[PDB]
Design a protein around this ligand. Sequence first.
Ligand SMILES: CC(=O)N[C@@H]1[C@@H](O)[C@H](O[C@@H]2O[C@H](CO)[C@@H](O[C@@H]3O[C@H](CO)[C@@H](O[C@@H]4O[C@H](CO)[C@@H](O[C@H]5O[C@H](CO)[C@@H](O[C@@H]6O[C@H](CO)[C@@H](O)[C@H](O)[C@H]6NC(C)=O)[C@H](O)[C@H]5NC(C)=O)[C@H](O)[C@H]4NC(C)=O)[C@H](O)[C@H]3NC(C)=O)[C@H](O)[C@H]2NC(C)=O)[C@@H](CO)O[C@H]1O
Ligand SMILES: *[C@@H]1O[C@H](CO)[C@@H](O[C@@H]2O[C@H](CO)[C@@H](O)[C@H](O)[C@H]2NC(C)=O)[C@H](O)[C@H]1NC(C)=O
Length: 362
Amino acid sequence: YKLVCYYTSWSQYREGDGSCFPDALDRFLCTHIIYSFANISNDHIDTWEWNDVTLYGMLNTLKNRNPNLKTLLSVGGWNFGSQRFSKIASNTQSRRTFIKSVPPFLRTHGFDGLDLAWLYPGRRDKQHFTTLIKEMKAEFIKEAQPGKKQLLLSAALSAGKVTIDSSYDIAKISQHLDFISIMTYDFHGAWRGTTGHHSPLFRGQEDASPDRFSNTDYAVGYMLRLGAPASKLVMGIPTFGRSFTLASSETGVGAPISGPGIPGRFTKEAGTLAYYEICDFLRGATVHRILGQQVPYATKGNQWVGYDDQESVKSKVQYLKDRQLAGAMVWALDLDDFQGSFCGQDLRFPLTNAIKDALAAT
Ligand SMILES: CC(=O)N[C@@H]1[C@@H](O)[C@H](O[C@@H]2O[C@H](CO)[C@@H](O[C@@H]3O[C@H](CO)[C@@H](O[C@@H]4O[C@H](CO)[C@@H](O[C@H]5O[C@H](CO)[C@@H](O[C@@H]6O[C@H](CO)[C@@H](O)[C@H](O)[C@H]6NC(C)=O)[C@H](O)[C@H]5NC(C)=O)[C@H](O)[C@H]4NC(C)=O)[C@H](O)[C@H]3NC(C)=O)[C@H](O)[C@H]2NC(C)=O)[C@@H](CO)O[C@H]1O
Ligand SMILES: *[C@@H]1O[C@H](CO)[C@@H](O[C@@H]2O[C@H](CO)[C@@H](O)[C@H](O)[C@H]2NC(C)=O)[C@H](O)[C@H]1NC(C)=O
């Protein structure tokens, strides 16, 4: 099975032990490590961080002692904005410029492929997205025609039905992509005004779910139904949790909230907590297994957070295997306990390692 793991270029700037550099990554943990994110200037793929070139090499060095490890450079991301992507994939000239600039850039920096993370093509770009992927694969094929190891092309897709229906032509793009990572998380947000796990495996109690499609199981099946070969589908598992600030004494699923949770000491982002920040939170907190959804949530004081732990990711792997999917995708390596000092056991990357172990099991 493939174990696609993301690494973010901005985790390096986190205070103390929060700081994470590519050399802190276990070269044997994943099968594919994707760097996030690359920028796009003058219709050319380009670096984002001032020291990207250094971190690129720092990451690709992991391939020395592990020849099987594959590396990809992802372009896009949430903070990128669909606007910029649209103008490039929409204009016939810019699309060419962009596509042509990718292979050289990847070879120059030691990457094995490109990962498209365009969030998200509007209903107005559904076809342009198809053309982009179609031509990008064409170029990659051409660039390796003489006998090179062909560059890989992947795409991180939304797991939300509405977005999937208006943005993707699953059947068409599945032919050209080497593998698809479905972002099966971020299913519930403070905007909803109630507590809810952002990455449940199944819908669970029919009575308490605001949506029939906001869960991993639905998204996976839907995409399979739409024409995404199971052999090319990688299921996303989050190593971060979504938090909320409770508004009453109610702490169960669906309880009232006043907004996102208090920012974590290291990630400093309201509504977000890295798994390692969660391990701290768990000290003196109560953990509840959500029956039906197969995932846990912890609560302490006026804070509530839905996340994934070793037990839940295990179940999720079981699910993906029973489904015969390509494997699991993790977001992100720098959100897992990479130091291995926060959750005890002195074990590094507990969640990701748990996923790896589960994939090899049975
Ligand atoms: C408004 C309304 O009422 N309408 C409703 C809709 O909202 C509902 O749809 C839902 O919309 C939300 C957004 O509103 C969707 O959420 C997004 O989901 C995607 C995945 O599908 C997420 O993207 C990927 O996952 C991670 C984690 O979520 C993303 O975030 C990381 O990346 C950003 C930048 O790219 C990081 O930002 C960094 O921040 C630090 C400091 O904070 C800074 O120093 C860095 O510089 C900065 N980085 C950069 C480069 O700028 C951020 O910290 C990361 N987060 C975490 C945690 O790690 C990645 O970008 C994505 N990864 C990949 C591989 O692409 C996306 O993050 C998320 N957006 C938000 C705001 O959280 C949601 O999917 C929709 N739901 C569904 C199911 O479709 C709609 C449906 O219910 O209902 C409407 O009514
Ligand atoms: C990524 O590339 C874009 C180019 O599209 C850069 O955006 C420019 O930002 C500067 C201000 O910082 C503006 O003066 C330009 O007009 C912007 N260009 C446009 C039209 O978007 C962006 O700065 C780059 N990001 C990084 C991290 O380097």
